[PDB]
Amino acid sequence: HHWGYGKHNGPEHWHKDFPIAKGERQSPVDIDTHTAKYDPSLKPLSVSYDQATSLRILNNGHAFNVEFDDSQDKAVLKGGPLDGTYRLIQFHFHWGSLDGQGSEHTVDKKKYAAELHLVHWNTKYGDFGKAVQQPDGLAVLGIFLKVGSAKPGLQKVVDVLDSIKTKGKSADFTNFDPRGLLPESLDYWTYPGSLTTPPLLECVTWIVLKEPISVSSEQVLKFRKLNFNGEGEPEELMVDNWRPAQPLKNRQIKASFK
Ligand SMILES: N=C(N)NC(=N)NCCc1ccc(S(N)(=O)=O)cc1
Ligand SMILES: N=C(N)NC(=N)NCCc1ccc(S(N)(=O)=O)cc1
Ligand SMILES: [Zn+2]
C-alpha cells in the first residue's frame, strides 16, 4: 500500500507515512497574483543549458523523468533568488485527465493542463541526496503548460513515451535540449517550499515562470496514455499525478516583474 494518485493512496493519505505533508513549507501553492510582491532586489534568472547532457527517460510509476548527467557544471540554474549554482538532475511533468486540471501550482486558482518541473540541486552540498536535506538544497523551475499550438521541442519526448509505457521501463534519451521547453519570458514568482511528492522534504526554492508554454492536444493525449502500473498488471492510466495546492502559512511569494 505505497503512495500514489488514487483514492486510497493519493495526496490526502500521504501524511500517514510522511507527516511533513502537514508542515509549514509545503508545495505546491496557489499564487495569488495581486498579493505577490514585486521584489526589485530579485535578479534575472540565469538558465545555462547549452551543455546539457540528457541520458535516459524513466517511467517511475508516478511520472516520467528525463535524467541528466549532473557530474559536472553543464546545465545550471543561477541568479534569480538563488545563491550559488544549481545543477540540473532531471525534469518531469504533472498532468491531468482533462485539460482543465493537471498543474500543481495554480494562479489565482487557475489550473493549467500540466506543469513541467526542471529539478536542480545546490552544488555546495555535493550530491542530490545531501541537497534534499537542506533548506536551500534544491531549485525547481516550474513551467505551466496550456493546450493550444504544439511545442516543437517537446515532440521528441512525446515520441519515446510508447517505449516506456509502464512502471520501471526506461529508454535511451540522449541529446535532448531542454531549452526547447522554455517560454519566451523568464519572468517568475518565487517562494520557499517542498518536494511535491513523498518524501515531501522542505528543501526547495520554487521558481515558477509566469508565461506558460503551449503544447498541442495531441501531445498531452500521449502523456495520458502512459500507465502507473507495471507491465502485465491491470492498466491504470497515468493521469492526475498532481498534488493540490497546500496552505501558504506565513510565506511570501515574490515576483520578479512589475
Ligand atoms: N553526479 C553523479 N556522478 N552521480 C549521480 N548519482 N547523478 C544523478 C543521477 C540521477 C539519479 C536519479 C535521477 S531520477 N530518476 O530521480 O530522475 C536522475 C539522475
Ligand atoms: N520518487 C521517485 N520515484 N522519483 C524521483 N526522481 N523523485 C525525486 C525527488 C523529487 C524531486 C522533485 C520533486 S518536485 N515534483 O517537487 O519537482 C519531487 C520529488
Ligand atoms: Zn514535480
PDB file of N, CA, C and O in Angstrom, residues 170-227:
ATOM      1  N   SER A 170      12.582   2.077 -18.938  1.00  0.00           N
ATOM      2  CA  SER A 170      13.430   3.191 -19.290  1.00  0.00           C
ATOM      3  C   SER A 170      13.873   3.047 -20.742  1.00  0.00           C
ATOM      4  O   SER A 170      13.793   1.945 -21.354  1.00  0.00           O
ATOM      5  N   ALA A 171      14.375   4.165 -21.279  1.00  0.00           N
ATOM      6  CA  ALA A 171      14.913   4.163 -22.623  1.00  0.00           C
ATOM      7  C   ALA A 171      16.049   5.158 -22.716  1.00  0.00           C
ATOM      8  O   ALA A 171      16.043   6.181 -22.038  1.00  0.00           O
ATOM      9  N   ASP A 172      16.841   4.959 -23.764  1.00  0.00           N
ATOM     10  CA  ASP A 172      17.917   5.885 -24.038  1.00  0.00           C
ATOM     11  C   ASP A 172      17.275   7.222 -24.342  1.00  0.00           C
ATOM     12  O   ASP A 172      16.194   7.303 -24.932  1.00  0.00           O
ATOM     13  N   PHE A 173      17.911   8.289 -23.881  1.00  0.00           N
ATOM     14  CA  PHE A 173      17.338   9.573 -24.242  1.00  0.00           C
ATOM     15  C   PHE A 173      18.430  10.613 -24.237  1.00  0.00           C
ATOM     16  O   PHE A 173      18.444  11.492 -23.431  1.00  0.00           O
ATOM     17  N   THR A 174      19.342  10.487 -25.173  1.00  0.00           N
ATOM     18  CA  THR A 174      20.489  11.365 -25.307  1.00  0.00           C
ATOM     19  C   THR A 174      20.177  12.512 -26.240  1.00  0.00           C
ATOM     20  O   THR A 174      19.276  12.453 -27.067  1.00  0.00           O
ATOM     21  N   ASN A 175      20.956  13.573 -26.069  1.00  0.00           N
ATOM     22  CA  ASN A 175      20.962  14.737 -26.950  1.00  0.00           C
ATOM     23  C   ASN A 175      19.657  15.503 -26.940  1.00  0.00           C
ATOM     24  O   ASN A 175      19.335  16.155 -27.913  1.00  0.00           O
ATOM     25  N   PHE A 176      18.894  15.448 -25.854  1.00  0.00           N
ATOM     26  CA  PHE A 176      17.695  16.256 -25.778  1.00  0.00           C
ATOM     27  C   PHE A 176      18.061  17.616 -25.186  1.00  0.00           C
ATOM     28  O   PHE A 176      18.661  17.706 -24.139  1.00  0.00           O
ATOM     29  N   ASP A 177      17.572  18.680 -25.810  1.00  0.00           N
ATOM     30  CA  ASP A 177      17.895  20.040 -25.433  1.00  0.00           C
ATOM     31  C   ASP A 177      16.738  20.664 -24.658  1.00  0.00           C
ATOM     32  O   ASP A 177      15.686  21.009 -25.251  1.00  0.00           O
ATOM     33  N   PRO A 178      16.840  20.816 -23.322  1.00  0.00           N
ATOM     34  CA  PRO A 178      15.702  21.329 -22.557  1.00  0.00           C
ATOM     35  C   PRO A 178      15.416  22.813 -22.791  1.00  0.00           C
ATOM     36  O   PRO A 178      14.366  23.292 -22.392  1.00  0.00           O
ATOM     37  N   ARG A 179      16.287  23.528 -23.511  1.00  0.00           N
ATOM     38  CA  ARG A 179      15.961  24.908 -23.893  1.00  0.00           C
ATOM     39  C   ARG A 179      14.693  24.942 -24.730  1.00  0.00           C
ATOM     40  O   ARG A 179      14.041  25.976 -24.781  1.00  0.00           O
ATOM     41  N   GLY A 180      14.395  23.857 -25.448  1.00  0.00           N
ATOM     42  CA  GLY A 180      13.200  23.782 -26.262  1.00  0.00           C
ATOM     43  C   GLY A 180      11.899  23.707 -25.480  1.00  0.00           C
ATOM     44  O   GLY A 180      10.836  23.665 -26.098  1.00  0.00           O
ATOM     45  N   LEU A 181      11.966  23.664 -24.153  1.00  0.00           N
ATOM     46  CA  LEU A 181      10.783  23.608 -23.307  1.00  0.00           C
ATOM     47  C   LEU A 181      10.514  24.923 -22.597  1.00  0.00           C
ATOM     48  O   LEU A 181       9.555  25.006 -21.838  1.00  0.00           O
ATOM     49  N   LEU A 182      11.357  25.936 -22.800  1.00  0.00           N
ATOM     50  CA  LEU A 182      11.157  27.201 -22.119  1.00  0.00           C
ATOM     51  C   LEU A 182      10.157  28.058 -22.884  1.00  0.00           C
ATOM     52  O   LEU A 182       9.981  27.906 -24.105  1.00  0.00           O
ATOM     53  N   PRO A 183       9.525  29.013 -22.168  1.00  0.00           N
ATOM     54  CA  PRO A 183       8.780  30.089 -22.815  1.00  0.00           C
ATOM     55  C   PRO A 183       9.753  31.203 -23.184  1.00  0.00           C
ATOM     56  O   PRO A 183      10.951  31.161 -22.866  1.00  0.00           O
ATOM     57  N   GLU A 184       9.199  32.241 -23.797  1.00  0.00           N
ATOM     58  CA  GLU A 184       9.982  33.360 -24.261  1.00  0.00           C
ATOM     59  C   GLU A 184      10.522  34.202 -23.104  1.00  0.00           C
ATOM     60  O   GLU A 184      11.660  34.646 -23.160  1.00  0.00           O
ATOM     61  N   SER A 185       9.681  34.463 -22.106  1.00  0.00           N
ATOM     62  CA  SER A 185       9.988  35.280 -20.943  1.00  0.00           C
ATOM     63  C   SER A 185      10.409  34.426 -19.769  1.00  0.00           C
ATOM     64  O   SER A 185       9.776  33.432 -19.515  1.00  0.00           O
ATOM     65  N   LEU A 186      11.385  34.886 -18.980  1.00  0.00           N
ATOM     66  CA  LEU A 186      11.806  34.226 -17.747  1.00  0.00           C
ATOM     67  C   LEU A 186      11.288  34.997 -16.527  1.00  0.00           C
ATOM     68  O   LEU A 186      11.806  34.838 -15.435  1.00  0.00           O
ATOM     69  N   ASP A 187      10.269  35.853 -16.671  1.00  0.00           N
ATOM     70  CA  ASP A 187       9.615  36.450 -15.511  1.00  0.00           C
ATOM     71  C   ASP A 187       9.064  35.342 -14.602  1.00  0.00           C
ATOM     72  O   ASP A 187       8.528  34.355 -15.088  1.00  0.00           O
ATOM     73  N   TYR A 188       9.171  35.514 -13.281  1.00  0.00           N
ATOM     74  CA  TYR A 188       8.853  34.435 -12.363  1.00  0.00           C
ATOM     75  C   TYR A 188       8.307  34.921 -11.030  1.00  0.00           C
ATOM     76  O   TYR A 188       8.497  36.087 -10.653  1.00  0.00           O
ATOM     77  N   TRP A 189       7.663  33.980 -10.337  1.00  0.00           N
ATOM     78  CA  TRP A 189       7.372  34.081  -8.929  1.00  0.00           C
ATOM     79  C   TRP A 189       8.303  33.132  -8.191  1.00  0.00           C
ATOM     80  O   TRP A 189       8.675  32.093  -8.724  1.00  0.00           O
ATOM     81  N   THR A 190       8.566  33.423  -6.913  1.00  0.00           N
ATOM     82  CA  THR A 190       9.424  32.536  -6.129  1.00  0.00           C
ATOM     83  C   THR A 190       8.940  32.499  -4.691  1.00  0.00           C
ATOM     84  O   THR A 190       8.479  33.508  -4.156  1.00  0.00           O
ATOM     85  N   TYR A 191       9.119  31.340  -4.063  1.00  0.00           N
ATOM     86  CA  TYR A 191       8.781  31.167  -2.666  1.00  0.00           C
ATOM     87  C   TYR A 191       9.483  29.918  -2.172  1.00  0.00           C
ATOM     88  O   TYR A 191       9.877  29.051  -2.965  1.00  0.00           O
ATOM     89  N   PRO A 192       9.669  29.788  -0.832  1.00  0.00           N
ATOM     90  CA  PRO A 192      10.276  28.596  -0.257  1.00  0.00           C
ATOM     91  C   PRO A 192       9.237  27.501  -0.076  1.00  0.00           C
ATOM     92  O   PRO A 192       8.181  27.728   0.517  1.00  0.00           O
ATOM     93  N   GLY A 193       9.570  26.295  -0.525  1.00  0.00           N
ATOM     94  CA  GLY A 193       8.631  25.196  -0.418  1.00  0.00           C
ATOM     95  C   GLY A 193       9.306  23.857  -0.305  1.00  0.00           C
ATOM     96  O   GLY A 193      10.369  23.670   0.287  1.00  0.00           O
ATOM     97  N   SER A 194       8.615  22.892  -0.895  1.00  0.00           N
ATOM     98  CA  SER A 194       8.939  21.492  -0.699  1.00  0.00           C
ATOM     99  C   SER A 194       8.904  20.686  -1.991  1.00  0.00           C
ATOM    100  O   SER A 194       8.388  21.141  -3.000  1.00  0.00           O
ATOM    101  N   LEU A 195       9.391  19.442  -1.923  1.00  0.00           N
ATOM    102  CA  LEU A 195       9.072  18.460  -2.951  1.00  0.00           C
ATOM    103  C   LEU A 195       7.555  18.279  -2.914  1.00  0.00           C
ATOM    104  O   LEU A 195       6.938  18.268  -1.849  1.00  0.00           O
ATOM    105  N   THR A 196       6.948  18.031  -4.073  1.00  0.00           N
ATOM    106  CA  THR A 196       5.511  17.846  -4.161  1.00  0.00           C
ATOM    107  C   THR A 196       5.117  16.373  -4.189  1.00  0.00           C
ATOM    108  O   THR A 196       3.930  16.089  -4.277  1.00  0.00           O
ATOM    109  N   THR A 197       6.071  15.448  -4.071  1.00  0.00           N
ATOM    110  CA  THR A 197       5.795  14.035  -3.854  1.00  0.00           C
ATOM    111  C   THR A 197       6.579  13.613  -2.632  1.00  0.00           C
ATOM    112  O   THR A 197       7.596  14.229  -2.301  1.00  0.00           O
ATOM    113  N   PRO A 198       6.163  12.511  -1.986  1.00  0.00           N
ATOM    114  CA  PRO A 198       6.963  11.924  -0.924  1.00  0.00           C
ATOM    115  C   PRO A 198       8.398  11.781  -1.387  1.00  0.00           C
ATOM    116  O   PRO A 198       8.648  11.344  -2.514  1.00  0.00           O
ATOM    117  N   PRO A 199       9.396  12.145  -0.561  1.00  0.00           N
ATOM    118  CA  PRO A 199       9.224  12.427   0.869  1.00  0.00           C
ATOM    119  C   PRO A 199       8.838  13.828   1.310  1.00  0.00           C
ATOM    120  O   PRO A 199       8.885  14.094   2.500  1.00  0.00           O
ATOM    121  N   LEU A 200       8.461  14.712   0.364  1.00  0.00           N
ATOM    122  CA  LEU A 200       7.851  15.991   0.724  1.00  0.00           C
ATOM    123  C   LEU A 200       8.798  16.906   1.507  1.00  0.00           C
ATOM    124  O   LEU A 200       8.363  17.807   2.221  1.00  0.00           O
ATOM    125  N   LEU A 201      10.093  16.738   1.270  1.00  0.00           N
ATOM    126  CA  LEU A 201      11.084  17.440   2.064  1.00  0.00           C
ATOM    127  C   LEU A 201      11.053  18.923   1.746  1.00  0.00           C
ATOM    128  O   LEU A 201      10.863  19.317   0.592  1.00  0.00           O
ATOM    129  N   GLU A 202      11.274  19.723   2.768  1.00  0.00           N
ATOM    130  CA  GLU A 202      11.166  21.165   2.689  1.00  0.00           C
ATOM    131  C   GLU A 202      12.495  21.794   2.325  1.00  0.00           C
ATOM    132  O   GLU A 202      13.150  22.487   3.117  1.00  0.00           O
ATOM    133  N   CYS A 203      12.924  21.526   1.101  1.00  0.00           N
ATOM    134  CA  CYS A 203      14.280  21.804   0.634  1.00  0.00           C
ATOM    135  C   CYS A 203      14.321  22.612  -0.661  1.00  0.00           C
ATOM    136  O   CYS A 203      15.375  22.721  -1.247  1.00  0.00           O
ATOM    137  N   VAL A 204      13.171  23.147  -1.105  1.00  0.00           N
ATOM    138  CA  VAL A 204      13.051  23.713  -2.446  1.00  0.00           C
ATOM    139  C   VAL A 204      12.885  25.225  -2.432  1.00  0.00           C
ATOM    140  O   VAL A 204      12.011  25.741  -1.758  1.00  0.00           O
ATOM    141  N   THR A 205      13.715  25.912  -3.243  1.00  0.00           N
ATOM    142  CA  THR A 205      13.366  27.250  -3.674  1.00  0.00           C
ATOM    143  C   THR A 205      12.602  27.088  -4.982  1.00  0.00           C
ATOM    144  O   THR A 205      13.164  26.650  -5.989  1.00  0.00           O
ATOM    145  N   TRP A 206      11.309  27.414  -4.960  1.00  0.00           N
ATOM    146  CA  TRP A 206      10.481  27.348  -6.143  1.00  0.00           C
ATOM    147  C   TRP A 206      10.616  28.592  -6.982  1.00  0.00           C
ATOM    148  O   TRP A 206      10.579  29.695  -6.461  1.00  0.00           O
ATOM    149  N   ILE A 207      10.764  28.390  -8.284  1.00  0.00           N
ATOM    150  CA  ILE A 207      10.794  29.454  -9.263  1.00  0.00           C
ATOM    151  C   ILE A 207       9.758  29.073 -10.314  1.00  0.00           C
ATOM    152  O   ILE A 207       9.989  28.126 -11.060  1.00  0.00           O
ATOM    153  N   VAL A 208       8.635  29.796 -10.347  1.00  0.00           N
ATOM    154  CA  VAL A 208       7.543  29.425 -11.222  1.00  0.00           C
ATOM    155  C   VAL A 208       7.434  30.492 -12.283  1.00  0.00           C
ATOM    156  O   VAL A 208       7.223  31.662 -11.974  1.00  0.00           O
ATOM    157  N   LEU A 209       7.603  30.118 -13.544  1.00  0.00           N
ATOM    158  CA  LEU A 209       7.536  31.103 -14.614  1.00  0.00           C
ATOM    159  C   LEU A 209       6.095  31.578 -14.828  1.00  0.00           C
ATOM    160  O   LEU A 209       5.153  30.813 -14.814  1.00  0.00           O
ATOM    161  N   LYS A 210       5.907  32.873 -15.089  1.00  0.00           N
ATOM    162  CA  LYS A 210       4.570  33.371 -15.349  1.00  0.00           C
ATOM    163  C   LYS A 210       4.035  32.931 -16.708  1.00  0.00           C
ATOM    164  O   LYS A 210       2.865  32.572 -16.843  1.00  0.00           O
ATOM    165  N   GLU A 211       4.884  32.966 -17.733  1.00  0.00           N
ATOM    166  CA  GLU A 211       4.443  32.667 -19.086  1.00  0.00           C
ATOM    167  C   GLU A 211       4.365  31.162 -19.276  1.00  0.00           C
ATOM    168  O   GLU A 211       5.354  30.452 -19.091  1.00  0.00           O
ATOM    169  N   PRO A 212       3.188  30.602 -19.645  1.00  0.00           N
ATOM    170  CA  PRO A 212       3.093  29.177 -19.918  1.00  0.00           C
ATOM    171  C   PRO A 212       3.720  28.888 -21.268  1.00  0.00           C
ATOM    172  O   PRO A 212       3.993  29.794 -22.051  1.00  0.00           O
ATOM    173  N   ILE A 213       3.984  27.609 -21.495  1.00  0.00           N
ATOM    174  CA  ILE A 213       4.231  27.113 -22.833  1.00  0.00           C
ATOM    175  C   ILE A 213       2.950  26.497 -23.354  1.00  0.00           C
ATOM    176  O   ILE A 213       2.086  26.033 -22.586  1.00  0.00           O
ATOM    177  N   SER A 214       2.813  26.538 -24.687  1.00  0.00           N
ATOM    178  CA  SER A 214       1.711  25.897 -25.389  1.00  0.00           C
ATOM    179  C   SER A 214       2.152  24.537 -25.904  1.00  0.00           C
ATOM    180  O   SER A 214       3.231  24.435 -26.466  1.00  0.00           O
ATOM    181  N   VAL A 215       1.335  23.515 -25.653  1.00  0.00           N
ATOM    182  CA  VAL A 215       1.513  22.192 -26.243  1.00  0.00           C
ATOM    183  C   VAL A 215       0.210  21.829 -26.941  1.00  0.00           C
ATOM    184  O   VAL A 215      -0.856  22.371 -26.629  1.00  0.00           O
ATOM    185  N   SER A 216       0.273  20.895 -27.887  1.00  0.00           N
ATOM    186  CA  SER A 216      -0.958  20.522 -28.569  1.00  0.00           C
ATOM    187  C   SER A 216      -1.752  19.485 -27.774  1.00  0.00           C
ATOM    188  O   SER A 216      -1.244  18.741 -26.928  1.00  0.00           O
ATOM    189  N   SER A 217      -3.045  19.420 -28.092  1.00  0.00           N
ATOM    190  CA  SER A 217      -3.925  18.398 -27.555  1.00  0.00           C
ATOM    191  C   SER A 217      -3.291  17.034 -27.768  1.00  0.00           C
ATOM    192  O   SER A 217      -3.218  16.256 -26.826  1.00  0.00           O
ATOM    193  N   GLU A 218      -2.749  16.799 -28.964  1.00  0.00           N
ATOM    194  CA  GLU A 218      -2.203  15.502 -29.305  1.00  0.00           C
ATOM    195  C   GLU A 218      -0.991  15.163 -28.432  1.00  0.00           C
ATOM    196  O   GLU A 218      -0.787  14.017 -28.039  1.00  0.00           O
ATOM    197  N   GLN A 219      -0.165  16.159 -28.134  1.00  0.00           N
ATOM    198  CA  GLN A 219       0.967  15.961 -27.248  1.00  0.00           C
ATOM    199  C   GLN A 219       0.529  15.532 -25.854  1.00  0.00           C
ATOM    200  O   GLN A 219       1.023  14.541 -25.300  1.00  0.00           O
ATOM    201  N   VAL A 220      -0.410  16.248 -25.254  1.00  0.00           N
ATOM    202  CA  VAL A 220      -0.807  15.887 -23.905  1.00  0.00           C
ATOM    203  C   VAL A 220      -1.615  14.581 -23.891  1.00  0.00           C
ATOM    204  O   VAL A 220      -1.508  13.814 -22.943  1.00  0.00           O
ATOM    205  N   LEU A 221      -2.345  14.259 -24.972  1.00  0.00           N
ATOM    206  CA  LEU A 221      -3.028  12.982 -25.048  1.00  0.00           C
ATOM    207  C   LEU A 221      -2.036  11.840 -24.911  1.00  0.00           C
ATOM    208  O   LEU A 221      -2.367  10.810 -24.324  1.00  0.00           O
ATOM    209  N   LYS A 222      -0.840  12.007 -25.459  1.00  0.00           N
ATOM    210  CA  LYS A 222       0.172  10.973 -25.404  1.00  0.00           C
ATOM    211  C   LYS A 222       0.705  10.831 -23.986  1.00  0.00           C
ATOM    212  O   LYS A 222       0.998   9.730 -23.531  1.00  0.00           O
ATOM    213  N   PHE A 223       0.786  11.912 -23.216  1.00  0.00           N
ATOM    214  CA  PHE A 223       1.130  11.746 -21.811  1.00  0.00           C
ATOM    215  C   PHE A 223       0.122  10.854 -21.103  1.00  0.00           C
ATOM    216  O   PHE A 223       0.465  10.038 -20.253  1.00  0.00           O
ATOM    217  N   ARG A 224      -1.154  11.045 -21.442  1.00  0.00           N
ATOM    218  CA  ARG A 224      -2.237  10.344 -20.758  1.00  0.00           C
ATOM    219  C   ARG A 224      -2.376   8.888 -21.167  1.00  0.00           C
ATOM    220  O   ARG A 224      -3.217   8.206 -20.606  1.00  0.00           O
ATOM    221  N   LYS A 225      -1.561   8.432 -22.112  1.00  0.00           N
ATOM    222  CA  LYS A 225      -1.532   7.024 -22.483  1.00  0.00           C
ATOM    223  C   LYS A 225      -0.532   6.208 -21.685  1.00  0.00           C
ATOM    224  O   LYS A 225      -0.516   4.985 -21.731  1.00  0.00           O
ATOM    225  N   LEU A 226       0.321   6.887 -20.927  1.00  0.00           N
ATOM    226  CA  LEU A 226       1.216   6.197 -20.011  1.00  0.00           C
ATOM    227  C   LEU A 226       0.429   5.474 -18.935  1.00  0.00           C
ATOM    228  O   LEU A 226      -0.750   5.728 -18.735  1.00  0.00           O
ATOM    229  N   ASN A 227       1.096   4.551 -18.250  1.00  0.00           N
ATOM    230  CA  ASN A 227       0.499   3.740 -17.207  1.00  0.00           C
ATOM    231  C   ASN A 227       1.242   3.941 -15.883  1.00  0.00           C
ATOM    232  O   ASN A 227       2.471   3.950 -15.850  1.00  0.00           O
TER     233      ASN A 227
END
